[PDB]
Design an enzyme around this catalytic site. Sequence first.
Site, PDB file in Angstrom:
ATOM      1  N   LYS A  27      -2.642   5.885  -4.697  1.00 52.09           N
ATOM      2  CA  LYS A  27      -3.675   6.758  -4.175  1.00 52.09           C
ATOM      3  C   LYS A  27      -3.404   8.066  -4.913  1.00 52.09           C
ATOM      4  O   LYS A  27      -2.223   8.684  -4.860  1.00 52.09           O
ATOM      5  CB  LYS A  27      -4.016   6.991  -2.710  1.00 52.09           C
ATOM      6  CG  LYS A  27      -3.907   5.782  -1.807  1.00 52.09           C
ATOM      7  CD  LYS A  27      -4.223   5.947  -0.559  1.00 52.09           C
ATOM      8  CE  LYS A  27      -3.876   4.735   0.209  1.00 52.09           C
ATOM      9  NZ  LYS A  27      -2.401   4.438   0.848  1.00 52.09           N
ATOM     10  N   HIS A  60      -7.603   9.075  -2.836  1.00 53.36           N
ATOM     11  CA  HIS A  60      -7.200   9.174  -1.290  1.00 53.36           C
ATOM     12  C   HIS A  60      -8.100   9.723  -0.397  1.00 53.36           C
ATOM     13  O   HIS A  60      -8.344   9.036   0.732  1.00 53.36           O
ATOM     14  CB  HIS A  60      -5.599   9.947  -1.241  1.00 53.36           C
ATOM     15  CG  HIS A  60      -4.853   9.490  -0.073  1.00 53.36           C
ATOM     16  ND1 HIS A  60      -3.337   9.568  -0.332  1.00 53.36           N
ATOM     17  CD2 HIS A  60      -5.052   8.864   1.098  1.00 53.36           C
ATOM     18  CE1 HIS A  60      -3.004   9.061   0.749  1.00 53.36           C
ATOM     19  NE2 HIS A  60      -3.882   8.610   1.819  1.00 53.36           N
ATOM     20  N   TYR A  97       2.944  10.036   0.610  1.00 49.40           N
ATOM     21  CA  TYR A  97       3.779   9.590   1.422  1.00 49.40           C
ATOM     22  C   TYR A  97       5.311   9.981   1.280  1.00 49.40           C
ATOM     23  O   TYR A  97       6.023   9.826   1.947  1.00 49.40           O
ATOM     24  CB  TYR A  97       3.788   8.125   1.849  1.00 49.40           C
ATOM     25  CG  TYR A  97       2.349   7.564   2.139  1.00 49.40           C
ATOM     26  CD1 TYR A  97       1.437   8.570   2.450  1.00 49.40           C
ATOM     27  CD2 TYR A  97       2.104   6.342   2.143  1.00 49.40           C
ATOM     28  CE1 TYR A  97       0.062   7.898   2.911  1.00 49.40           C
ATOM     29  CE2 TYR A  97       0.550   5.844   2.250  1.00 49.40           C
ATOM     30  CZ  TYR A  97      -0.358   6.688   2.944  1.00 49.40           C
ATOM     31  OH  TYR A  97      -1.524   6.240   3.112  1.00 49.40           O
ATOM     32  N   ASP A 119       0.767  -1.070  -0.056  1.00 44.82           N
ATOM     33  CA  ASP A 119      -0.080   0.147   0.090  1.00 44.82           C
ATOM     34  C   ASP A 119       0.896   1.335   0.159  1.00 44.82           C
ATOM     35  O   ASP A 119       1.725   1.456   0.895  1.00 44.82           O
ATOM     36  CB  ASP A 119      -0.906  -0.123   1.152  1.00 44.82           C
ATOM     37  CG  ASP A 119      -1.847   1.375   1.154  1.00 44.82           C
ATOM     38  OD1 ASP A 119      -2.823   1.224   0.364  1.00 44.82           O
ATOM     39  OD2 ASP A 119      -1.574   2.130   1.909  1.00 44.82           O
TER      40      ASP A 119
HETATM   41  N1  LIG Z   1      -6.043   5.875   3.025  1.00 40.40           N
HETATM   42  C1  LIG Z   1      -5.581   6.544   3.994  1.00 40.40           C
HETATM   43  O1  LIG Z   1      -6.199   7.662   4.231  1.00 40.40           O
HETATM   44  C2  LIG Z   1      -4.541   5.897   4.962  1.00 40.40           C
HETATM   45  C3  LIG Z   1      -4.240   6.609   6.219  1.00 40.40           C
HETATM   46  C4  LIG Z   1      -3.593   6.126   7.195  1.00 40.40           C
HETATM   47  C5  LIG Z   1      -2.890   4.765   7.031  1.00 40.40           C
HETATM   48  N2  LIG Z   1      -3.092   4.197   5.687  1.00 40.40           N
HETATM   49  C6  LIG Z   1      -2.393   2.867   5.130  1.00 40.40           C
HETATM   50  O2  LIG Z   1      -2.558   2.254   6.272  1.00 40.40           O
HETATM   51  C7  LIG Z   1      -0.881   1.655   6.698  1.00 40.40           C
HETATM   52  C8  LIG Z   1      -1.011   1.292   8.118  1.00 40.40           C
HETATM   53  O3  LIG Z   1      -1.464   2.027   8.954  1.00 40.40           O
HETATM   54  P1  LIG Z   1      -0.483   3.312  10.047  1.00 40.40           P
HETATM   55  O4  LIG Z   1       0.853   3.259   9.178  1.00 40.40           O
HETATM   56  O5  LIG Z   1      -1.233   4.349  10.160  1.00 40.40           O
HETATM   57  O6  LIG Z   1      -0.322   2.367  11.238  1.00 40.40           O
HETATM   58  P2  LIG Z   1      -0.355   0.656  11.705  1.00 40.40           P
HETATM   59  O7  LIG Z   1      -0.063  -0.167  10.643  1.00 40.40           O
HETATM   60  O8  LIG Z   1      -1.603   0.773  12.746  1.00 40.40           O
HETATM   61  O9  LIG Z   1       0.740   0.950  13.048  1.00 40.40           O
HETATM   62  C9  LIG Z   1       2.193   1.150  12.431  1.00 40.40           C
HETATM   63  C10 LIG Z   1       3.106   1.021  13.653  1.00 40.40           C
HETATM   64  O10 LIG Z   1       2.976   0.042  14.547  1.00 40.40           O
HETATM   65  C11 LIG Z   1       4.250  -0.567  14.631  1.00 40.40           C
HETATM   66  N3  LIG Z   1       4.040  -2.074  14.744  1.00 40.40           N
HETATM   67  C12 LIG Z   1       4.082  -2.840  13.365  1.00 40.40           C
HETATM   68  N4  LIG Z   1       4.018  -3.945  13.661  1.00 40.40           N
HETATM   69  C13 LIG Z   1       4.323  -3.955  15.171  1.00 40.40           C
HETATM   70  C14 LIG Z   1       4.289  -5.445  15.872  1.00 40.40           C
HETATM   71  N5  LIG Z   1       4.172  -6.536  15.355  1.00 40.40           N
HETATM   72  N6  LIG Z   1       4.521  -4.953  17.169  1.00 40.40           N
HETATM   73  C15 LIG Z   1       4.390  -3.777  17.567  1.00 40.40           C
HETATM   74  N7  LIG Z   1       4.632  -2.598  16.939  1.00 40.40           N
HETATM   75  C16 LIG Z   1       4.418  -2.959  15.416  1.00 40.40           C
HETATM   76  C17 LIG Z   1       5.169   0.157  13.423  1.00 40.40           C
HETATM   77  O11 LIG Z   1       6.446   0.251  14.206  1.00 40.40           O
HETATM   78  P3  LIG Z   1       7.750  -0.144  13.086  1.00 40.40           P
HETATM   79  O12 LIG Z   1       7.414   0.518  11.815  1.00 40.40           O
HETATM   80  O13 LIG Z   1       8.758   1.028  13.986  1.00 40.40           O
HETATM   81  O14 LIG Z   1       7.971  -1.357  13.425  1.00 40.40           O
HETATM   82  C18 LIG Z   1       4.587   1.497  13.449  1.00 40.40           C
HETATM   83  O15 LIG Z   1       4.979   2.192  14.511  1.00 40.40           O
HETATM   84  C19 LIG Z   1      -0.313   2.839   6.327  1.00 40.40           C
HETATM   85  O16 LIG Z   1       1.325   3.028   6.492  1.00 40.40           O
HETATM   86  C20 LIG Z   1      -0.709   3.404   4.923  1.00 40.40           C
HETATM   87  O17 LIG Z   1      -0.215   2.449   4.021  1.00 40.40           O
HETATM   88  C21 LIG Z   1      -3.966   4.750   4.834  1.00 40.40           C
HETATM   89  O1  LIG Z   2      -3.805  10.432   4.668  1.00 41.47           O
HETATM   90  C1  LIG Z   2      -3.095   9.468   4.885  1.00 41.47           C
HETATM   91  O2  LIG Z   2      -2.943   8.604   4.098  1.00 41.47           O
HETATM   92  C2  LIG Z   2      -2.166   9.420   6.163  1.00 41.47           C
HETATM   93  O3  LIG Z   2      -2.067  10.543   6.930  1.00 41.47           O
HETATM   94  C3  LIG Z   2      -1.214  11.557   6.057  1.00 41.47           C
HETATM   95  C4  LIG Z   2      -0.104  11.199   5.310  1.00 41.47           C
HETATM   96  C5  LIG Z   2       0.592  12.141   4.710  1.00 41.47           C
HETATM   97  F1  LIG Z   2       1.794  11.639   4.125  1.00 41.47           F
HETATM   98  C6  LIG Z   2       0.388  13.739   4.826  1.00 41.47           C
HETATM   99  C7  LIG Z   2      -0.688  13.821   5.663  1.00 41.47           C
HETATM  100  C8  LIG Z   2      -1.586  12.765   6.118  1.00 41.47           C
HETATM  101  C9  LIG Z   2      -2.854  13.361   7.192  1.00 41.47           C
HETATM  102  S1  LIG Z   2      -2.677  14.779   7.999  1.00 41.47           S
HETATM  103  N1  LIG Z   2      -3.840  12.647   6.821  1.00 41.47           N
HETATM  104  C10 LIG Z   2      -5.330  13.277   7.435  1.00 41.47           C
HETATM  105  C11 LIG Z   2      -6.419  13.938   6.380  1.00 41.47           C
HETATM  106  C12 LIG Z   2      -5.838  14.371   5.171  1.00 41.47           C
HETATM  107  C13 LIG Z   2      -6.802  14.895   4.286  1.00 41.47           C
HETATM  108  C14 LIG Z   2      -8.015  15.071   4.850  1.00 41.47           C
HETATM  109 BR1  LIG Z   2      -9.426  15.725   3.601  1.00 41.47          BR
HETATM  110  C15 LIG Z   2      -8.408  14.380   6.000  1.00 41.47           C
HETATM  111  C16 LIG Z   2      -7.477  13.983   6.625  1.00 41.47           C
HETATM  112  F2  LIG Z   2      -7.777  13.555   8.209  1.00 41.47           F
END
Ligand SMILES: NC(=O)c1ccc[n+]([C@@H]2O[C@H](COP(=O)([O-])OP(=O)(O)OC[C@H]3O[C@@H](n4cnc5c(N)ncnc54)[C@H](OP(=O)(O)O)[C@@H]3O)[C@@H](O)[C@H]2O)c1
Ligand SMILES: O=C(O)COc1cc(F)ccc1C(=S)NCc1ccc(Br)cc1F
Length: 315
Positions: free
Chosen positions: A77, A110, A48, A43
Amino acid sequence: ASRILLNNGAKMPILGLGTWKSPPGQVTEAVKVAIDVGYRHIDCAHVYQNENEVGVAIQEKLREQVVKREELFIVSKLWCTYHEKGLVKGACQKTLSDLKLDYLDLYLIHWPCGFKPGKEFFPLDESGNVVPSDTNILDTWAAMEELVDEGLVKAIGISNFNHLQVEMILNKPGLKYKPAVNQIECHPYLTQEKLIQYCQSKGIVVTAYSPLGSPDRPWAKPEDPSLLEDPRIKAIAAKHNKTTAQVLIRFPMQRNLVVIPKSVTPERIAENFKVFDFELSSQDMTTLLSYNRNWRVCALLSCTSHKDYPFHEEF
Ligand SMILES: NC(=O)c1ccc[n+]([C@@H]2O[C@H](COP(=O)([O-])OP(=O)(O)OC[C@H]3O[C@@H](n4cnc5c(N)ncnc54)[C@H](OP(=O)(O)O)[C@@H]3O)[C@@H](O)[C@H]2O)c1
Ligand SMILES: O=C(O)COc1cc(F)ccc1C(=S)NCc1ccc(Br)cc1F
Ligand SMILES: [Br-]
């Protein structure tokens, strides 16, 4: 069962690697390790700022013949500053160039919100509010449909769309391709039962982001709830001889969701994949669902007055 069938006829791996916040100097190794240990879904997103480094890993594993391109499922995205008819193709093309790909398996809007185009990802007015675009979700969707017809992407979808916004797409006059996926925040503290049932009833696959509660989100506060440290979840994990993270990843899988935990730690990347050899009971599932508190971690004050900001609604 490792993959879910999408409404475009393609199969999507239910477990993928997240890359938001993965440092550019660690994400190439993270993705190489991930592919070596079995991940076939990554993803990504332009916003990012690490797609080039993700792409170095993907390309090396393709060159090494560790995997075939057809076996990978690469998601990116369209960022908010590119919602404009004349900017969508170039935004997609920039992502393809960075990722070293000639197509994406899935390309998402996104966020529902369009922002003023320019260099800045979050253009602000003098008082700190995001500057909108006048282009609406329907016209952006039409631009996404063109990417399918040009061969740049195999599937299109949406992210952070609320119930009414999903419905708006589904009801679009002249809709050509339905969204394949809605990627939304989902974990035991934000269980999303209403939105998930709506999307699944329409044949839209839901991807759960932040499944571990995003402990590295930049706006975390010491007082905030912590999934990985919740003793009730630790108890379920202990019962199954698994880690808390493994329970948190298996949970959405058993709800017929796709899940994309992020890590740059090799040991955790491998651990997080070891979730296909145990089963949470129905009681475990309902117990995890019971922890809902409607807590988001992914929300943003500067964007809350945008006309399409999604979290004003209820779901
Ligand atoms: N569509 C969107 O708007 C949106 C928004 C947010 C997220 N996303 C996608 O979703 C992905 C996942 O969400 P997220 O990055 O917000 O957070 P997450 O996956 O809920 O949590 C990541 C955190 O958990 C830690 N971690 C991972 N595996 C672990 C384990 N086995 N034990 C303990 N800690 C662990 C990682 O540490 P380390 O990396 O230091 O190991 C990092 O600090 C994002 O990276 C992105 O690709 C999309
Ligand atoms: O967005 C991600 O994937 C993870 O988050 C982010 C990842 C980035 F690389 C930069 C900003 C964000 C933020 S601040 N995202 C929240 C966000 C953005 C836009 C709108 Br509309 C609402 C909202 F809640
Ligand atoms: Br938004």
